């Protein structure tokens, strides 16, 4: 990496001295060293970059966002100085984009990546990095435009293939997405051994009927992405007990189960009240999990937060659930009514995390046609009874009755999770 211009070469001694202090670990002593090199040589790109790396390392030690916001600015100052080496320009701005995403300034990291692509229009990897910026902000349209430009120049790039296939699969182009995912994973290129692409390639093959989906599930299990071929969640805490079906006494939430089963009729009546007088509060499933049919949900708690407007439609149920922090505080689960109408088949899928167990309270259950499979066992609901299963295992639902099926979903923390974990885990 050529990082010194002509003027910095004349002061390589003072630069390497302060760089040693940063490498030795005296981050405080190195910051003040580069700070005075900048004060002494205000146009040195390396001394400005060295000040930025010290602020970066210092922000790690102090765990400060304000210090990291200072490094982000110093990384930009290296780009304003004159006669800056091209390799130093890429590293200074790429680190700014990376740290901007760390803080959540996703819109700012996009602008920084756009500048890099405008400065280096031939770097394929920089365009690929810009595509990831769009996928982190939710702009799959512009992400597809980028990875199309990459594949028109470098059509053998696996990184662009798996991301192009991920967008096509997100856009319900299931058949077209498979070749981009299978080839990108097999490219072996850096960044293609991600469990997300194994999960979506096997899911895409399952919907089209290709039995080789489980060969890709087992391969992801061998490389450490999946806990098993059945438990394919990706936001996981290692060590938790894993079994597809649980019993109430096994979970330890016996007080919650009894409150639900003792008072199931009031929960049902408040849900039917929303059905009859506020259909708008039931929103359709929006995760493309349906092959066919109508499936709506009326959410009361999400990510540990209570929807005040929703609890105005089911007040007694919200008051009942208020007594149990094991479900109201589950920031990786929800509490919702789930209505499913005849002719509905939900694709085999997996929940995002293993940190929650999912409870189903039977409210309005038709006598035939309804059944849910988790792993290799199929069970059915019963009115006034609670089913408990680990939705991180592959599960599948059919509804082929002559009337609607209404259940109550209550997510709880995994019982083996420590309270420190329940308070620290990022919400999902």
């Amino acid at each position: 990496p050529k990082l010194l211009n002509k003027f910095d070469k004349t002061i390589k001694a003072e630069l390497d001295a302060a760089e040693k202090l940063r490498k030795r670990g005296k981050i405080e002593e190195a910051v003040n060293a580069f700070k005075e090199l900048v004060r002494k040589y205000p146009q040195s790109p390396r001394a400005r970059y060295g000040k930025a790396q010290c602020e970066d390392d210092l922000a790690e030690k102090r765990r400060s966002n304000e210090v990291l916001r200072g490094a982000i600015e110093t990384y930009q100052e290296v780009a304003s100085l004159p006669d800056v080496p091209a390799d130093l320009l890429k590293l200074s701005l790429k680190r700014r984009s990376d740290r901007q995403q760390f803080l959540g300034h996703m819109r700012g990291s996009l602008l920084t990546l756009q500048r890099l692509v405008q400065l280096f229009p031939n770097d394929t990897s920089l365009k690929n990095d810009l595509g990831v910026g769009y996928l982190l902000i939710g702009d799959n349209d512009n992400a597809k435009k980028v990875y199309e430009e990459v594949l028109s120049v470098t059509p053998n790039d696996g990184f662009a293939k798996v991301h192009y296939g991920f967008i096509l699969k997100a856009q319900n182009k299931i058949a077209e997405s498979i070749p981009y995912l299978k080839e990108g994973i097999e490219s072996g290129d850096p960044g293609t051994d991600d469990g997300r692409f194994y999960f979506h390639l096997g899911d895409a093959m399952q919907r089209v009927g290709n039995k080789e989906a489980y060969k890709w599930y087992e391969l992801g299990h061998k490389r450490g992405h999946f806990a098993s071929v059945w438990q394919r969640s990706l936001y996981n805490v290692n060590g938790l007990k894993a079994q597809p079906w649980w019993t109430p006494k096994e979970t330890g939430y016996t007080e919650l189960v009894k409150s639900l089963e003792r008072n199931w009729k009031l929960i049902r009546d408040e849900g039917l009240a929303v059905m009859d007088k506020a259909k708008g509060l039931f929103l359709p499933e929006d995760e493309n999990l349906r092959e066919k049919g109508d499936w709506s949900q009326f959410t009361l708690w999400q990510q540990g937060r209570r929807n005040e407007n929703a609890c105005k439609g089911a007040p007694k149920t919200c008051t009942l659930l208020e007594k149990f922090p094991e479900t109201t505080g589950c920031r990786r689960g929800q509490i919702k009514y789930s209505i499913m109408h005849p002719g509905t088949h939900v694709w085999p899928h997996t929940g995002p995390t293993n940190c929650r167990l999912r409870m189903h309270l039977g409210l309005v259950i038709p006598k035939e046609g309804c059944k849910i499979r988790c792993a290799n066992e199929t069970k059915t609901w019963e009115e006034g009874k609670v089913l408990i299963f680990d939705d991180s295992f592959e599960h599948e639902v059919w509804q082929d009755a002559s009337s609607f099926r209404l259940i109550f979903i209550v997510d709880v923390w995994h019982p083996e999770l420590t309270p420190q974990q329940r308070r620290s885990l990022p919400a999902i």
């Binding site: 922000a59 765990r63 400060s64 966002n65 990291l68 995403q101 760390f102 803080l103 959540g104 996703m106 990831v132 996928l135 982190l136 991920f166 997100a170 997300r196 999960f199 969640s233 990706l234 936001y235 499933e285 995760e287 493309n288 999990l289 999400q302 929800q334 899928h349 997996t350 929940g351 995002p352 995390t353 939705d391 990022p426 919400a427 999902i428």
Partner: peptide, 17 residues
Amino acid sequence: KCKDGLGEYTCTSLEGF
């Protein structure tokens, strides 16, 4: 958001340290 499934590139939000 990832609720019953996992159809998003990232299911969490970054907020720094």
